[PDB]
Design an enzyme around this catalytic site. Sequence first.
Site, short mmCIF file in Angstrom:
data_model
loop_
_atom_site.label_atom_id
_atom_site.label_comp_id
_atom_site.label_asym_id
_atom_site.label_seq_id
_atom_site.Cartn_x
_atom_site.Cartn_y
_atom_site.Cartn_z
N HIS A 39 37.24 35.02 47.35
CA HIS A 39 38.48 35.57 46.77
C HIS A 39 38.34 37.05 46.35
O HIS A 39 39.36 37.66 46.02
CB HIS A 39 39.11 34.71 45.64
CG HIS A 39 38.29 34.57 44.39
ND1 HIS A 39 37.76 33.35 44.01
CD2 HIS A 39 38.00 35.48 43.43
CE1 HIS A 39 37.14 33.56 42.86
NE2 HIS A 39 37.25 34.84 42.48
N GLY A 48 35.63 38.52 35.17
CA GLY A 48 34.51 39.26 35.72
C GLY A 48 33.24 38.44 35.92
O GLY A 48 32.27 38.94 36.50
N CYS A 67 32.91 35.75 37.85
CA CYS A 67 32.84 35.21 39.23
C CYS A 67 31.59 35.66 39.94
O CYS A 67 31.19 36.82 39.77
CB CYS A 67 34.09 35.60 40.02
SG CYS A 67 35.59 34.74 39.51
#
Lengths: 301, 301
Positions: free
Chosen positions: A41, A143, A145
Amino acid sequence: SGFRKMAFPSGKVEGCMVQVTCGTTTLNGLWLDDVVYCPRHVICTSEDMLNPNYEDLLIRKSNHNFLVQAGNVQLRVIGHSMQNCVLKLKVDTANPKTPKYKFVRIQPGQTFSVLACYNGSPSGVYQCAMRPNFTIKGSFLNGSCGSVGFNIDYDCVSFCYMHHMELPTGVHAGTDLEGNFYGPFVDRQTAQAAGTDTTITVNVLAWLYAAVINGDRWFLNRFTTTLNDFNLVAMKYNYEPLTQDHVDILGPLSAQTGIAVLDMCASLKELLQNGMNGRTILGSALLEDEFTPFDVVRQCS
Amino acid sequence: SGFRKMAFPSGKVEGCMVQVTCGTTTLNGLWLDDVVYCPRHVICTSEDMLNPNYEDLLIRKSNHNFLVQAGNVQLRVIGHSMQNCVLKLKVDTANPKTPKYKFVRIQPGQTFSVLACYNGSPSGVYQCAMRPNFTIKGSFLNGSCGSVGFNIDYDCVSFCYMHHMELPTGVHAGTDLEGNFYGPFVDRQTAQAAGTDTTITVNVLAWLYAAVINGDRWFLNRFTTTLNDFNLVAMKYNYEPLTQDHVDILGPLSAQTGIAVLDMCASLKELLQNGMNGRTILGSALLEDEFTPFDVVRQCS
């Protein structure tokens, strides 16, 4: 003596953490050899998340659209590919601090250490379990991820989780290192919610054995039970069923304490029916289910 | 979202851990530059521990009596000295992985990460606080001596603890990195016991603010209190007194949530008087005191 939530030493993982940038999105990547692994993503805008076709989105990107930063040095992206829900960015430099590693997809009930990162820098380390509903009760902000979950066997790092999202109840969802989500979760903006959760029974029994190993045995009794009768009471209290395999896994802990597994099950049955009556077990007023029988063996005497 | 017991990344500390051997005793050492720091009781036999004169014992030792092992390589001891209750072994090789560091002696109530080691190899990492009675509720087995406690500020490691012993209640005692014990403990076999402990009040208030930040506010009320009236109720429940300094430290958390410190004190007062009535706060049925106001700021939104 003592019993604490214990994470694996995070050193081997810290030397792999990098920052990945694509357009206006910045998340973390896992640098192993000349490949950087990260959630796919990273290529999407907020609008793309409504109904994304990732194959069509990735074909619009070039290698120069990706920015990899390891400490001070900037790594050049010389290739890119997608495997399930993870993006693999080929870089011109192989990581000199790559440890011996494995990618493993874990079962619900298993625990792992999480190294939370922001902008390619580790912020902290903590322990958690894959819940029976395939979510994790972690601690993640925007942040995070690309942060990973792992276990360490001798000198080999087994990566089992990559963080992708937070669900509306505050629980977290992600994939294994090959990009397959745990649970029925997808990487798109849809109404998705965690299903009903249950308590990991084999883990509660392991933690009661750890309490006996550390000297507290007020909860023990003279009773025993059958595997079937215990399972009848477990289902009532929203506990996972106990299998014969779980009983075998609990064998080494049963042989160290002298308490039969079915005897420990009768203590758990009474603890669920009568509560704790104002008493604690290893500093806890609630029954703990995020220590596997292996975790107890590793930390205890 | 989420709130967990979070340790600092342990990488900078792992690269410093070595194994120290003297005669038949084996414990851990902290290798920083060309000096290895370790508990001075490494030179003693069990008989020496009854009434030791360490100055007289150390004068009987030579450099070849000490064995230092870093991974596979064996480091040669070229000097030795004693500073309080720590031994400093000068070695022929400076540690290439020495991070930027400080030795700091902490106050009671402050937290740190522990890297538990056995034979020079880290086993795991966990978080704990220096209790008001100057003991720590850690998780340590035989061979853990020399394991260290630390905090990380930017890229600088602040070592605050070195492990030495376990007291009869199962709690742990040790020194700062300059060899001064926390509390009235000594490194000799005498009847020593932990004094009465109290709850760290400023830390409970910080953890209630973290709960508000994460969305649970059932425990809030419309009442306020004076610092004196709250302190009258705190002393009754075995809580540490709250000073004006603690109120100032809680300022940034008070400004983020909109709840005055004295308003949060009235919620704590009601929680102590009435209990939780079958309810939890951040997955806990007990009030938590091992998160400082700084720990909450570092992990929360």
